[PDB]
Curated annotation (Swiss-Prot):
Name this protein carries in UniProt: CD109 antigen
Gene Ontology, cellular component aspect: cell surface; cytosol; extracellular region; extracellular space; plasma membrane; platelet alpha granule membrane; side of membrane
Native source organism of the sequence: Homo sapiens (Human)
Gene3D superfamilies in the cross-refs: 1.50.10.20, 2.20.130.20, 2.60.120.1540, 2.60.40.1930, 2.60.40.1940, 2.60.40.2950, 6.20.50.160, Alpha-macroglobulin, receptor-binding domain
Example GO molecular function: serine-type endopeptidase inhibitor activity
Impact upon substituting Y627S: In allele Gov(b)
Length: 1178
């Protein structure tokens, strides 16, 4: 019985925590019972170890799954092989294997902060939510790390435990923190996940602008219309002015723009006629998009808010758009498509235009004979209509062209399925919206009589369903693992053994089995009124996280909450990319979502309430329900006149994660209130005009007396009638449903936060508000920072005492002085995750071989000296060194010189041979380097030395940035001396004394250039010359120092070169404590771009960073730092061990003139203490 026997489909990817499910189908020509064993093998260091395995017995004519056990989540990117072996009772039947791609995303995490914009002296409250792939809660140990934009580790929590996946943590910011995008990192299992939140100086806006405009606009349209809605947070309309800039984005023309300035009361309509886009199509061939910018200024405060939208311009009045069409042509089957014909402005299509028929031209070409057919179709009321036309059997390319009233659309389908029997099937879906649990219908059509169909459903690179359907139409029920995109592959085998298949990719909308509903007790409430928030969940023993914030937090255009969009983005992150194969007849159709097939089937009169409490985050609740499905939490409404927006999430062990469908709003509003137009920061002594806006929303115009309370922290400039208080009260008239503004000149006289109490009294109502102004100090801000390294790596000494002093300038503004002291146990280095991307194959020419070779050596030396090198990366690294060493040894000539092309170039380069000697000398503890090659390079470099010691280059260097290091011969001598000066390991008799005398003479005449000076300093520090100290001192004199920063800026990569060379000069002269600002400059010049830029400064920078780590390579740290002195009445103690070695611990000291501290370190290791002084001058 010849024919097909088996068909085994296994996915080509593997993720940790996901079961590798394969599908086995046994056919008519196979025996009764076939035992299928699937093995997973890990290939490390040319050892293949069977990690996971499973076995099963399958019967003839049955389609079942063989499921492997789950991979552990601790695994990494190793070589994985899947081997499938199907056996009979006395003989094997198939035995094959493949490679598997690895995906690093194993679990889901959500970092929810209460807001994304934070003021200084605030508190960040956040939750870490750890879930599985099927959104069940995950219990694990993890680390939380909060860092500044300068990437110093400021806060950390080590080995926290998650109670049902939710971790609630808080973090108090400093008084003056580093402004910018702070980062929260979670190191769960072996993966780091990031979440950025901004810390800046901002004032919360009290209203929002929405701009309702059509997305498209026709050129033949007479008017472009739109609506502007400026609305307060508490729901009242905004009375103000609008400036409207209609600006074409044509870069060919000028900045011509229509401007329209008018008035707005809540909502306002605008329209532009053709005399307002007459400058627009003058400026624009095809027209580009235009920008409509709205600036609304509130007429009582002057606070302006601007929004912008983009409008695309279409040349025709109607747009004809297509969907629901197969991307692969199927011969002898009906092509179906759905057409939306809509107007440009988005309005409904009129009954007059419905009489015009859409002319659709089909063009089937055998790519060269073509068949062209024009069909007329009617248009419905909604404008969405389906077309269906047959396809001829020889058609290879289909061209569709639709015309309607001059509007044209066209596309072409070129992908043709080829079959020897010319038998094809088509799988189509009828439901536009597919959800989880709702069954959806599938229709299978074919040009011939169909056999028993077999369907396989694959989602997230995992085969999640199998089965056999005999009917040509069947219903399938999606599950939670099908999200977001599912492959339904429907196939059957003909009598000659040919597989006939179709693959349908469908988006599956995720529904949640767990539901959480939030209800306020009231829709509208007053401030300081007790309301109740009711939480209703689906299941008991659930943990509920509730956030309820100000609406202006949502109006800050930044949010870090857990919503449906983040869940959809994480589900799209679960989806992966796929690769290609050899495409026998349908294996591309199989591999459309990553499937690898094994088969043989192809062969042959009261005081007002004083409003003081103004928070931005009202409710930050983290509770456990226990036995309750609903709970009522009683809260007090704060004093902010706004709307409070509440959302939340629920986590249960049975159902998983659940989210609120809509945010629920509570309106905190009173009809008579006070608004203070305040900036964030005022300087002390400056007279600023406080703007008090009395908002009256009653039905009558009221005479309001505004009374500001006296304080000793500020002065009111204008006087009052009485002598008890100056500027005590003012009188004004506020209209009904409007606001009025009164100015008060205020001169603050004290630093810090100052309270202002404003009381508005009317015969109808009253209000009182107490608000904080942050008053800073006048003058110009200056910063000083001094760093001291305390070294305890030697076990002879145990206590080290150092002194740090600073004297203030005499023109310092009093009260502006701030003294901080930070202690760290280790420096911030390059991150290992990006540096693993910096290791590569040595390829190309010899200079390209060095470009792909040398940073691998210096990165391997750096993580060898930092003790963070994994074994697989190590074996890959030394494999790269061996192959790069062989590729560089291909380019060695007969005289020992090296070049880019080897023997093809006429003369070799001295600089490239020096680079060869330096890289091969560094690589010699790691790989085996032949000493005759190194001796030949010594003799060829020594043969190019003159009598004075000056060296000369007869060769050529192709690359610019390799030759960009200063072609003057003094740099050549210094580079060849610092490359030849590592050669003392083998023999120590190197006579470069004439060259050292030449470099000392070149230093003695006086150097203007700067890289050259750093190279002379490194050479003289390496030989231990007496002129090295003067050169390093004058190079430190040439350095720019600011903010604990020492660097060199060239007036014309080279800055990193001079910083690393002077750093190695400081290390070789035992001035380790002075290299710390340069080391911080090296730490800061690599944060935004991963590793180090280019290669030539990358090598020297990682050499200096590994040379620091080799000097302080003690893995045990137990350092106690005690800070005493006149500036500290209590001794400040920092404890540094191996866990908090990266923690930048900080402490604040009193202001004593002059500021002097004594820092005593006791223990073992090394520590760095930095004294920072911030002062304002006049
Ligand atoms: C866009 O706004 C303009 C505002 O002028 C509208 O033009 C007016 O339309 C009404 C109703 O047809 C006429 O009675 C007026 O005489 C028109 N005013 C003019 C031309 O200045 C226009 O209809 C609006 N278009 C849309 C699509 O809403
Ligand atoms: C719209 O165009 C006008 C010019 O027709 C711009 O007005 C000038 O703008 C510049 C830059 O702000 C000012 O320096 C001039 O004093 C303005 N003069 C006039 C005559 O208005 C206007 O700024 C444009 N609007 C936008 C937002 O692009
Ligand atoms: C070598 O680097 C130093 C920086 O340390 C350069 O000196 C700076 O020159 C600029 C531009 O005129 C000044 O604004 C700085 O004040 C200087 N800083 C210091 C620390 O002196 C110097 O110019 C560089 N040399 C060359 C040849 O580029
Ligand atoms: C801080 O360090 C200084 C310098 O070590 C200490 O200086 C003292 O100076 C007086 C001068 O008469 C000597 O008599 C002391 O013996 C010194 N003490 C030493 C050397 O430790 C100073 O006392 C230290 N104390 C504080 C808290 O500032
Ligand atoms: C893997 O199989 C086990 C065994 O039943 C099951 O509990 C687990 O949920 C499966 N995991 C996935 C991701 O399907
Ligand atoms: C299994 O491996 C062999 C050896 O390369 C190969 O010839 C064959 O095509 C593979 N597949 C099957 C189904 O035997
Ligand atoms: C703006 O146009 C809409 C659409 O007809 C209309 O309902 C609304 O009243 C208009 N607003 C103003 C202020 O004219
Ligand atoms: C609004 O205007 C200010 C001041 O020019 C500008 O800083 C801000 O970016 C603008 N915002 C928008 C959304 O255009
Ligand atoms: C294609 O559509 C026409 C018109 O409804 C119908 O007669 C024909 O049977 C269809 N063919 C297939 C294969 O569905
Ligand atoms: C479509 O309408 C045009 C114009 O009336 C006519 O010339 C053409 O023959 C029509 N085509 C069909 C298929 O009815
Ligand atoms: C599938 O349906 C056909 C048509 O009725 C029938 O002949 C065949 O036996 C069915 N196969 C199975 C396995 O039910």
């Amino acid at each position: 019985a010849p024919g097909p026997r088996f068909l085994v489909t296994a996915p080509g990817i593997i993720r940790p925590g996901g079961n590798v499910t394969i599908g086995v189908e046994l056919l008519e020509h196979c025996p009764s019972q076939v035992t299928v064993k699937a093995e997973l093998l890990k290939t490390a260091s040319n050892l293949t170890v069977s990690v996971l395995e499973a076995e099963g017995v399958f019967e003839k004519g049955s389609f079942k799954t063989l499921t492997l056990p789950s991979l552990p989540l601790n695994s990494a990117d190793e070589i994985y092989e899947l081997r499938v072996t199907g056996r009979t009772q006395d003989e094997i039947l198939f035995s094959n294997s493949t490679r598997l791609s690895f995906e690093t995303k194993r679990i889901s995490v959500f970092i929810q902060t209460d807001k994304a914009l934070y003021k200084p002296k605030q508190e960040v409250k956040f939750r870490i939510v750890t879930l599985f792939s099927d959104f069940k809660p995950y219990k694990t140990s993890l680390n939380i790390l909060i860092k500044d934009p300068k990437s110093n580790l400021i806060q950390q929590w080590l080995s926290q435990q998650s109670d049902l996946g939710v971790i609630s943590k808080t973090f108090q910011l400093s008084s003056h923190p580093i402004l910018g995008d702070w980062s929260i990192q979670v190191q769960v299992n072996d993966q780091t996940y990031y979440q950025s939140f901004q810390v800046s100086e901002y004032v919360l806006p009290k209203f929002e602008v929405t701009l309702q405009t059509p997305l498209y606009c026709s050129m033949n349209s007479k008017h472009l219309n739109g609506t502007i809605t400026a609305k307060y947070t508490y729901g009242k309309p905004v009375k103000g002015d609008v400036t409207l800039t209609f600006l074409p984005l044509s870069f060919w023309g000028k900045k011509k723009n229509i401007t329209k300035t008018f008035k707005i009361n809540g909502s306002a309509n605008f329209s532009f006629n053709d005399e307002e886009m007459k400058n627009v199509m003058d400026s624009s061939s095809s027209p580009g998009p235009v920008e409509i910018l709205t600036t609304v200024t509130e007429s009582v405060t002057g606070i302006s808010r601007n929004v912008s939208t983009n409008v695309f311009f279409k040349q025709h009045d109607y747009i004809i758009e297509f969907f629901d069409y197969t991307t692969v042509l199927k011969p002898s089957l009906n092509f179906t498509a759905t057409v939306k014909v809509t107007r440009a402005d988005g309005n409904q299509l009129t009954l007059e235009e419905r009489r015009n028929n859409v002319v659709i031209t089909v063009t089937q070409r055998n790519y060269k004979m073509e068949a062209v057919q024009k069909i007329n179709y009617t248009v419905p009321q909604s404008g969405t209509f389906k077309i269906e036309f047959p396809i001829l059997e020889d058609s290879s390319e289909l061209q569709l062209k639709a015309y309607f009233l001059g509007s044209k659309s066209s596309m072409a389908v070129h992908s043709l399925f080829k079959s020897p029997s010319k038998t094809y099937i088509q799988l189509k879906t009828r439901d536009e919206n597919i959800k989880v649990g709702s069954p959806f219908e599938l229709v299978v059509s074919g040009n011939k009589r169909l056999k028993e169909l077999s369907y396989m459903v694959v989602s997230r690179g995992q085969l999640v369903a199998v089965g056999k359907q005999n009917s040509t139409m069947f219903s399938l029920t999606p599950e939670n693992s099908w999200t977001p995109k599912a492959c339904v592959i429907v196939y059957y085998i003909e009598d000659d053994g040919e597989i006939i298949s179709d693959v349908l990719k469908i988006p599956v909308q995720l529904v949640f089995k767990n539901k959480i509903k939030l209800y306020w007790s009231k829709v509208k409430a007053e401030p300081s009124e007790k309301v109740s928030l009711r939480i209703s969940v689906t299941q008991p023993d659930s943990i509920v996280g509730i956030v309820a914030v100000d609406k202006s937090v949502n109006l800050m255009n930044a949010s870090n909450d857990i919503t449906m969009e983040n869940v959809v983005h994480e589900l799209e992150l679960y989806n992966t990319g796929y690769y290609l194969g050899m495409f026998m007849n349908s294996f591309a159709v199989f591999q459309e979502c990553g499937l690898w097939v094994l088969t043989d089937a192809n062969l042959t009169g009261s005081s007002p309430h004083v409003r003081k409490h103004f928070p931005e985050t009202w409710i930050w609740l983290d509770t456990n329900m226990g036995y309750r499905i609903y709970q009522e939490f009683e809260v007090t409404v704060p004093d902010s006149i706004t709307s409070w927006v509440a959302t939340g999430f629920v986590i249960s062990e049975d159902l998983g994660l659940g989210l609120t469908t809509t945010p629920v709003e509570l309106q905190a509003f009173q009809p008579f209130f006070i608004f203070l137009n305040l900036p964030y920061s005022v300087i002390r002594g400056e007279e600023f005009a406080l703007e008090i806006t009395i908002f009256n929303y009653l039905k009558d115009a009221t005479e309001v007396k505004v009374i500001i309370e006296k304080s000793d922290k500020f002065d009111i400039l204008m006087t009052s009638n009485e002598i008890n208080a100056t500027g005590h009260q003012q009188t004004l008239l506020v209209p009904s449903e409007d606001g009025a503004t009164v100015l008060f000149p205020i001169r603050p006289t004290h630093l810090g936060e100052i309270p202002i109490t404003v009381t508005a009294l009317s015969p109808t109502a009253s209000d009182a508000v107490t608000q904080m102004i942050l008053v800073k100090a006048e003058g110009i801000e200056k910063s000083y920072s001094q760093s001291i390294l305390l070294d305890l790596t030697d076990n002879r000494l145990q206590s080290t005492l150092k002194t740090l002093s600073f004297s203030f300038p005499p023109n310092t503004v009093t009260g502006s002085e701030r003294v901080q002291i930070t202690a760290i146990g280790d420096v911030l280095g390059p991150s290992i995750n990006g540096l693993a991307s910096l290791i590569r194959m040595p390829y190309g020419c010899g200079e390209q071989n060095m470009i792909n070779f040398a940073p691998n050596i210096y990165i391997l030396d750096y993580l060898t000296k930092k003790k963070q090198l994994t074994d697989n990366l190590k074996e890959k690294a030394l494999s790269f060194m061996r192959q790069g060493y062989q590729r560089e040894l291909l380019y060695q000539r007969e005289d020992g010189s090296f070049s880019a092309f080897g023997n093809y170039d006429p003369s070799g380069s001295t600089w490239l041979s020096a680079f060869v000697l330096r890289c091969f000398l560094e690589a010699d503890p790691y790989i085996d380097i032949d000493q005759n090659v190194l001796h030949r390079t010594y003799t060829w470099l020594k043969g190019h030395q003159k009598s004075n010691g000056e060296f000369w280059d007869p060769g050529r260097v192709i690359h610019s940035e390799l030759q960009g290091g200063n072609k003057s011969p003094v740099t050549l001598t210094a580079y060849i001396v610092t490359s030849l000066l590592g050669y003392r390991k083998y023999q120590p008799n190197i006579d470069v004394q004439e060259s050292i005398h030449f470099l000392e003479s070149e230093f003695s005449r006086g150097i203007s250039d700067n890289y050259t000076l750093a190279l002379i300093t490194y050479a003289l520090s390496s030989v231990g010359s007496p002129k090295a100290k003067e050169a390093l001192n004058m190079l430190t004199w040439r350095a720019e120092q600011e903010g604990g920063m020492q660097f060199w800026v060239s007036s014309e990569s080279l800055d990193i070169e001079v910083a690393a060379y002077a750093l190695l000069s400081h290390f070789l002269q035992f001035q380790t404590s002075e290299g710390i600002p340069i080391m911080r400059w090296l730490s800061r010049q690599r944060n935004s771009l991963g590793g180090f830029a280019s290669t030539q400064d990358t090598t020297v920078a990682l050499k200096a960073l590994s040379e620091f780590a080799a000097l302080m390579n003690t893995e045990r740290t137990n350092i106690q730092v005690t800070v005493t002195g006149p500036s500290s009445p209590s001794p400040v103690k920092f404890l540094i061990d191996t866990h908090n070695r990266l923690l930048l611990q900080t402490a604040e000291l009193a202001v004593v003139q002059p500021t002097a501290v004594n820092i005593s370190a006791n223990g073992f290791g090394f520590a760095i203490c930095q004294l920072n002084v911030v002062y304002n001058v006049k």
